[PDB]
Amino acid sequence: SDPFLVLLHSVSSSLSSSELTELKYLCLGRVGKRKLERVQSGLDLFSMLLEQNDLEPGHTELLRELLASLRRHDLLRRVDDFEAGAAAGAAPGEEDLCAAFNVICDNVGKDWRRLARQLKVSDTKIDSIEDRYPRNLTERVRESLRIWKNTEKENATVAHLVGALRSCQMNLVADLVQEVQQARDLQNRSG
After folding, report:
1. Which of 57, 69, 160, 180 suits a disulfide with 91, CB 3.0-4.6 Å?
2. How far is CA 102 from CA 69, 141, 145, 161, in A?
3. Residue 94 Cα distances to 89, 122, 174, 178, angstroms
């Protein structure tokens, strides 16, 4: 029940029925026959491409290609501001993620070196960071968390962090974060 996705639903509901039809087809190289044929409503592009992650509830640059193509600049500009500047709780997954991340942040092993690799923080950074601060905790925990929430901010889903937590091997908080995930995903993916 997400404010950005509401807005996505709201641009779809501001569009005519041919245009929805056309949009389905015209995405030839992006939605192909099988994916094409099965979807029901006008929303069901929007529904799917969120689902498969062609966009997120942060920025939808790809979706804004589609909006642009179908002329309506009016629809664009409201959506544009949302993505440009008003990304405060726009993806609402971040908060329970941040909650969980705060919890993980408190109990820390020297394993942010493995973990930053595993999550795919860039190796040229890792190599340097490793060399720079070998034995220490402090600048590692600050680097690793900052670079992760820089890198995977637009793909901050709880599964990343669930997997990440377990890598650091704090098991008590693991099951806690898992129920954070389980209840949160279910309710929020639903609509």
Report:
1. 57
2. 42, 12, 10, 11
3. 7, 22, 18, 15
| Helix H or strand E segment including 65 | helix 61-69
3-class SS string, the chain: CCHHHHHHHHHHCCCCHHHHHHHHHHCCCCCCHHHHHHCCCCHHHHHHHHHCCCCCCCCCHHHHHHHHHCCCHHHHHHHHHHHHCCCCCCCCCHHHHHHHHHHHHHCCCCCHHHHHHHCCCCHHHHHHHHHHCCCCCHHHHHHHHHHHHHHCCCCCCHHHHHHHHHHHCCHHHHHHHHHHHHHHHHHHHHC
- The DSSP call for residue 76 is H
Question: Vertex 156, ends 187 and 162: CA angle to 5°?
Answer: 75
Q: Can you give the length of the chain in residues?
A: 191
CB 182 within 8 A of CB 91: no
Name which of 110, 107, 123, 104 is nearest 164 in CA terms.
Answer: 104
Experimental method: NMR
Domains along the chain with CATH numbers:
1-86 (1.10.533.10), 87-191 (1.10.533.10)
Q: Which sign, positive or negative, has the C-alpha torsion 168, 174, 176, 182?
A: positive
Q: How buried is residue 33: exposed, middle or buried, by Cβ count under 10 Å (0-12/13-18/19+)?
A: exposed
